């Protein structure tokens, strides 16, 4: 019965979880870790990744 208010909660939680899990994507970069990008690369190429 409470599906209307629970689906709201589920949609919000999925939205937040997807937002946070987007922090593990390369998006075409060498890594999703800024520290790794800034330690394994020079400043110029780091400014591209």
């Amino acid at each position: 019965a409470l599906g209307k208010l629970q689906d709201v909660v589920n949609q919000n939680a999925q939205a937040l979880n997807t937002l946070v899990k987007q922090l593990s994507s390369n998006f075409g970069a060498i890594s999703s870790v800024l520290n790794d990008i800034l330690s394994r690369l020079d400043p110029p190429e780091a400014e591209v990744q």
């Binding site: 020079d42 400043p43 110029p44 190429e45 400014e47």
Partner: protein, 49 residues
């Protein structure tokens, strides 16, 4: 200044090496030209300059 040929490539933004780190560092936001010509008839001597 005067630099050996192999280090001329180090006179550019985002370069690394002995020259670009200890002698002459160009900023990452460099706006200007870099001109270099092989002056082997003025800065090279038989006994060693």
């Amino acid at each position: 200044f005067v630099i050996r040929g192999d280090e001329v490539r180090q006179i550019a933004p985002g370069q690394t090496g002995n020259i670009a780190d200890y002698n002459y560092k160009l900023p990452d936001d460099f706006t200007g030209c870099v001109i270099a010509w092989n002056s082997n008839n003025l800065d090279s001597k038989v006994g060693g300059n």
